[PDB]
């Protein structure tokens, strides 16, 4: 109400919300635009996910550092402006190459392929970097200062941000469809790009204000390769390190949300509305996670929540494996059951480890460690992204699921070890 709406705790609740939705939308849009040009194959457009992984996976630590180095206002403005400009340029070039010229021959083994690939992949790198940086340079840092010394509300805000993310992630494609309907390829691109400009412009003033509000944020304290090395050594030392690893390990499992399990599940295609119902069940589990986390966090020690969520995950995965076991329709239904209960457990778990990383890290080293946490998540996600190929055969797409379950077990056991090495071995 009124004040509450102009309470910074919410203002940000939008600023980040505008960034999430818009960014996801742009990403999906470009993805479709590409696959529309060259038939989605092993090499065509498949390169895109891979290069976006690699980019951040290598560059994160140094972003996060530079963040830590500079101011708060200035760095946030640079992160936003850059992203906006990048998206704008990308859309412009896309339209230009969409209209004027669509297939010409150059010299020195150069074709609209090599040329557009280089230009758009540079644009993609820029945009992705912008989004992923505008996060550790704003999200985790702002949640730590805006929240204040007080926890309670900080954790509530973290859960709220996790929810919004799940919503946007499940609302971006839907909007992209309606955008195909009227917007199409020739104009649709131009529209979402101009929008992003508007979104970016608004976010700029929003954050200027939020900073005007809680004044704490004015307070602070081979060169790139050296910086990356320093960030990695800093991340290995921290006592939280163990749990951090656990987090990334979970980003390894393939079965979950939309991926190869969904691709093999789409093959069966129960019915057109059946897929929508499955998507709704997923989103529900994702949200019903954050509530569970908040409750447990209140009722039992934070470290303790993690272990419990872990048992939960593992249990639903018992379901999944015994399903594929088919021992003494069915198995398919069970697969989604498992992915779902997994979703709830997993999302709690993430919320905890996020809070850990959020408080047990010195002020100055805030960026670098979150940066590295990204990179590790991407590195562990790369294996799952590299697991799409080399065994894309959905025939024995059961042993790969067993391997994912094994990795999950490893991560959970690592988190259990961290917990024991933290509180008394008695729970």
């Amino acid at each position: 109400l009124a004040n509450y709406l102009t309470s910074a705790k919410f203002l940000l609740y939008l600023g980040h919300s505008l960034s999430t939705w818009g960014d996801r939308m742009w990403h999906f849009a470009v993805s479709v635009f590409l696959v529309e040009l060259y038939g989605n194959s092993l090499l065509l457009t498949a390169v895109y996910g891979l290069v976006v992984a690699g980019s951040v996976l290598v560059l994160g630590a140094i972003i996060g550092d530079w963040v830590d180095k500079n101011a708060r206002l200035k760095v946030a403005q640079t992160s936003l402006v850059i992203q906006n400009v990048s998206v704008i340029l990308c859309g412009i070039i896309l339209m230009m190459v969409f209209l004027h010229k669509d297939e010409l021959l150059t010299m020195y083994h150069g074709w609209v392929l090599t040329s557009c690939y280089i230009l758009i992949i540079t644009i993609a790198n820029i945009a992705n970097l912008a989004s992923t940086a505008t996060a550790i340079t704003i999200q985790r840092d702002w949640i730590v200062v805006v929240a204040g010394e007080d926890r309670s509300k900080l954790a509530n805000m973290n859960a709220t941000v996790r929810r919004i993310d799940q919503l946007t992630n499940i609302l971006a494609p839907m909007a992209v469809g309606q955008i195909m309907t009227y917007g199409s390829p020739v104009i649709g691109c131009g529209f979402i790009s101009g929008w992003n400009l508007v979104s970016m412009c608004v976010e700029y003033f929003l954050l200027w204000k939020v900073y005007q509000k809680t004044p704490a944020l004015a307070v602070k304290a081979a060169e790139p390769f050296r910086t990356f090395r320093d960030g990695w050594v800093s991340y290995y030392n921290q006592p939280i390190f163990l749990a951090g690893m656990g987090l990334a390990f979970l980003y390894m499992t393939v079965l979950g949300f939309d991926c190869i399990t969904t691709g093999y599940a789409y093959t069966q295609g129960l019915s057109g509305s059946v897929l929508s119902i499955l998507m709704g069940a997923s989103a529900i589990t994702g949200i019903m996670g954050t509530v569970a986390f908040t409750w447990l966090r209140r009722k039992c020690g934070l470290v303790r929540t993690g272990l419990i969520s872990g048992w939960a995950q593992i249990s639903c995965l018992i379901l999944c494996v015994i399903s594929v076991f088919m021992p003494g329709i069915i198995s398919v239904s069970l697969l989604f059951a498992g992915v779902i209960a997994a979703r709830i457990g997993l999302w709690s778990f993430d919320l905890t480890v996020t809070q850990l990383l959020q408080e047990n890290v010195i002020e100055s080293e805030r960026g670098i460690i979150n940066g590295v946490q990204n990179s590790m998540n991407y590195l562990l996600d790369l294996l799952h992204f590299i697991m799409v190929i080399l065994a894309p055969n959905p025939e024995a797409f059961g042993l790969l699921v067993l391997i994912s379950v094994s990795f999950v077990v490893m991560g959970h056991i690592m988190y259990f070890r961290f917990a024991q090495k933290t509180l008394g071995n008695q729970l």
Epitope: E149, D150, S234, N237, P239, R298, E359
Partner: antibody, heavy 120, light 108 residues
Framework: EVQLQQSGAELVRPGALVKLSCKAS????????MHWVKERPEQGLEWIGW????????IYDPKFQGKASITADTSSNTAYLQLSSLTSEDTAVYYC?????????????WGQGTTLTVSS | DIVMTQSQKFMSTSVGDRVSITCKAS??????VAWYQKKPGQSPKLLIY???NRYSGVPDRFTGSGSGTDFTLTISNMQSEDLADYFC?????????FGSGTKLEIKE
């Protein structure tokens, strides 16, 4: 101005109980973990345990798990340590300290210290 | 448990001298070591956390260095407000342990 003021200067026949208090001022006991530390006469610092005032979770040093009970009251904004079955060895200065995370880099603010004398 | 060790109980120094106090873990702490100074009849105050960071408001002549297992506090150009006790705490893992301390003393 953040302070932690402690009850002071208790003298206790051995085998009894005693409860030592640590009252915070300028911050919320609930946003922190509260640690108890013991400094024997001419000896090094020793850690007794912490309590999470929100849910009341306590962790102790295995050599204090028998005869130390850390409790807290957020309403009064104060933390307590109960020592039971006292002996001659218990005489020391007890400190109350304030840490932010499970792995906060430091104890920024400390209690003034409470001399406890166990003799007959 | 990690048993922090300070070999020297005493260090005989003089004003304007660089004195280096050493602390040695029993396991790989990493950079999880902070440095407290306490004067007789007082509470320990921070100097240096995470083995290199200098807490906000302590003079610029207190330096901290080291990693892994062997750490060092370093007083450059010691003054007469520095004669005290120093000890290293490790927060790598619970139970926390403190260094047994190292008392400075002006040298005659």
């Amino acid at each position: 101005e953040v302070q932690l003021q402690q009850s002071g200067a208790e003298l206790v026949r051995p085998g009894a109980l005693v409860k030592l208090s640590c009252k915070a001022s300028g911050f919320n006991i609930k946003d922190y973990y509260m640690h108890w530390v013991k400094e024997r006469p001419e000896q090094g610092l020793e850690w007794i345990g912490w309590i999470d005032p929100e849910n009341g979770n306590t962790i102790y040093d295995p050599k204090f798990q028998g005869k130390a009970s850390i409790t807290a009251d957020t309403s009064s904004n104060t933390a307590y340590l109960q020592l039971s079955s006292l002996t001659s060895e218990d005489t020391a200065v007890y400190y109350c300290a304030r840490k932010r995370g499970y792995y906060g880099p430091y104890f920024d603010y400390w209690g003034q210290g409470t001399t406890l004398t166990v003799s007959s | 448990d990690i048993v922090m060790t300070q070999s020297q109980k005493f260090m005989s120094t003089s004003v304007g001298d660089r004195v280096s106090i050493t602390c040695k873990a029993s396991q790989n702490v990493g950079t999880a070591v902070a440095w407290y100074q306490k004067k007789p009849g007082q509470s320990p105050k921070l100097l240096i956390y995470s083995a290199s960071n200098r807490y906000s408001g302590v003079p610029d002549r207190f330096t901290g260095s080291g990693s892994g297992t062997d750490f060092t506090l370093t007083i450059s150009n010691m003054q007469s407000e520095d004669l005290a006790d120093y000890f290293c705490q490790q927060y790598g893992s619970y139970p926390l342990t403190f260094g047994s301390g190292t008392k400075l003393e002006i040298k005659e």
